[PDB]
């Protein structure tokens, strides 16, 4: 499936099985743009987080319960949700994916 292949390709499960990961299907500029949208607090209680005004196409990759390295296994869940990212630097760009509502 897409998750098993994309997680491998992106060097995410080549040396371990990453529990969860989200892939956004929007242009890189459109996601970078979220850093100047709705400001919200991050889970940890920080405030360099931003929620997108709109929902975006995303694919959630969840490791099955029986998954174990080297045989990593993922449950693929496609969806449209508002993304929340943590921004930092100059230019001000996303460095962390906080969540999808």
């Amino acid at each position: 499936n897409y998750c098993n292949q994309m997680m491998k390709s992106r060097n995410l499960t080549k040396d371990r099985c990453k529990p969860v990961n989200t892939f956004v299907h929007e242009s890189l500029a459109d996601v970078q743009a979220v850093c100047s949208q709705k400001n919200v607090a991050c889970k940890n209680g920080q405030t360099n987080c931003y929620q997108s005004y709109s929902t975006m196409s995303i694919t959630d990759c969840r490791e099955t319960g029986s998954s174990k390295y080297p045989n990593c296994a993922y449950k693929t869940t496609q969806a449209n949700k508002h993304i929340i990212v943590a921004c930092e630097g100059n230019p001000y760009v996303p460095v962390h994916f906080d969540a999808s509502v």
Binding site: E26, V95, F97
Partner: peptide, 15 residues
């Protein structure tokens, strides 16, 4: 090495 913004891209971007 790979910056935090570059890592975000390799890990979450699939335009």
């Amino acid at each position: 090495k790979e910056t935090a913004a570059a890592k975000f891209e390799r890990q979450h971007m699939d335009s």
